[PDB]
Enzyme design. Structure first.
Site, mmCIF file in Angstrom:
data_model
loop_
_atom_site.group_PDB
_atom_site.id
_atom_site.type_symbol
_atom_site.label_atom_id
_atom_site.label_comp_id
_atom_site.label_asym_id
_atom_site.label_seq_id
_atom_site.Cartn_x
_atom_site.Cartn_y
_atom_site.Cartn_z
ATOM 1 N N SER A 161 0.828 -1.102 -0.250
ATOM 2 C CA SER A 161 -0.171 0.028 -0.004
ATOM 3 C C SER A 161 1.103 1.006 -0.170
ATOM 4 C CB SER A 161 -1.245 -0.031 1.520
ATOM 5 O OG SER A 161 -1.726 1.107 0.806
ATOM 6 N N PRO A 165 5.556 6.926 9.280
ATOM 7 C CA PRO A 165 4.998 6.013 9.997
ATOM 8 C C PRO A 165 3.257 6.388 11.097
ATOM 9 C CG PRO A 165 6.883 7.005 10.315
ATOM 10 C CD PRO A 165 5.893 7.500 9.077
ATOM 11 N N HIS A 219 0.667 7.104 9.451
ATOM 12 C CA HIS A 219 -0.208 7.733 8.799
ATOM 13 C C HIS A 219 -1.099 6.762 9.473
ATOM 14 C CE1 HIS A 219 -3.051 5.978 5.197
ATOM 15 N NE2 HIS A 219 -2.294 6.771 4.738
ATOM 16 N N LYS A 238 4.265 -4.214 6.812
ATOM 17 C CA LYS A 238 4.032 -4.311 5.783
ATOM 18 C C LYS A 238 4.986 -3.914 4.874
ATOM 19 C CE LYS A 238 -1.065 -4.938 4.260
ATOM 20 N NZ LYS A 238 -0.588 -6.097 3.221
#
Ligand SMILES: NC(=O)c1ccc[n+]([C@@H]2O[C@H](COP(=O)([O-])OP(=O)(O)OC[C@H]3O[C@@H](n4cnc5c(N)ncnc54)[C@H](OP(=O)(O)O)[C@@H]3O)[C@@H](O)[C@H]2O)c1
Length: 253
Positions: A133, A139, A141, A155
């Site tokens: 994504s 970080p 987000h 991820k």
């Protein structure tokens, strides 16, 4: 091995994964499909054919048979948060989301993917493609708070591990996914979330599926990490020259 490569796609009954599986099947002049799914349920969903295996990426013994004799891997697994069942809109909260225990991003997107890359490497896979994504550059987000899972962070940890692994790889950080027609949009490649500053930051699940397939056919796609957005349908000219597309990308991570 003038033989066509055997391509295993994981998460094969997910929304994007099922399309990759379909395209691998249709592409019988270029690939031999294989798929890995979490349940007999998912197996039947994509057609119950004998090239579909059932297994859980958080338990590495279970995925072993799927990984035997593959030449390429497309990782399309993901942690998936569910709405916490207590919600009551009519006095202003917002829904809370959760991940089942042992199903959190740390376990599924990091460890789970580590499991897959490690078994692929044991099996002598030549190229691993992974879908993730956009957002990972930040970080803070909002997505990382979903179910307290830090999904983007875990991820990106797996993407880093893949890039550091020594196996040729393609990391495809998708923009917001769309349940709309594929092959009908100009597709855009970005670096380090630049497309988030544009109005071309979402992408049909079918186009993500197709980019995964083309990654397999061009040396240019190997050892590459890039973001994937698209321009809307009817606006411009749908991408066809993937060699060009992948030659736009220089980032290894
Ligand atoms: N949704 C978005 O707008 C967004 C945006 C950008 C990037 N992405 C990323 O894009 C990728 C594709 O998204 P998508 O919505 O098309 O995927 P999806 O529908 O959620 O599919 C995810 C697959 O992961 C499988 N899975 C979960 N845990 C597993 C385990 N323990 N063992 C084996 N398989 C497991 C699920 O199996 P089941 O079918 O049994 O549940 C499912 O098929 C994901 O990595 C996602 O995070 C999503």
């Amino acid at each position: 091995s003038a033989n066509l490569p055997t391509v295993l796609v994981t998460g094969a009954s997910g929304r994007t994964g099922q399309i990759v599986y379909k395209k691998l099947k249709e592409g019988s002049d270029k690939f031999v499909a294989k798929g890995l799914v979490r349940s007999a349920q998912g197996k039947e969903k994509i057609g119950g054919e004998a090239d579909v295996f059932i297994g859980d990426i958080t338990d590495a013994d279970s995925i072993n048979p799927a990984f035997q004799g593959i030449d390429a891997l497309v990782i399309l697994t993901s942690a998936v948060p569910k709405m916490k069942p207590g919600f009551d809109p009519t006095k202003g909260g917002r829904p809370e989301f959760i991940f089942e225990d042992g199903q959190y991003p740390e376990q599924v997107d990091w460890i789970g993917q580590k499991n897959q890359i490690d078994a692929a490497k044991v099996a002598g896979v030549k190229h691993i493609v992974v879908v993730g994504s956009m957002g990972g550059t930040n970080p803070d987000h909002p997505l990382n708070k979903l179910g307290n899972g830090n999904i983007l962070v875990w991820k990106r940890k797996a993407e880093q591990y893949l890039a550091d692994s020594g196996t040729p790889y393609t990391i495809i950080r998708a923009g917001g996914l769309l349940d709309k027609e594929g092959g009908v949009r100009e597709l855009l490649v970005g670096k380090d979330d630049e497309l988030l500053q544009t109005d071309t930051k979402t992408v049909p699940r079918a186009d993500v599926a197709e980019v995964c397939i083309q990654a397999l056919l061009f040396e240019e796609a190997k050892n590459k990490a890039f973001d994937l957005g698209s321009k809307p349908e009817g606006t411009s000219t749908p991408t066809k020259d993937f060699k060009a597309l992948f030659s736009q990308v220089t980032s290894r991570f």
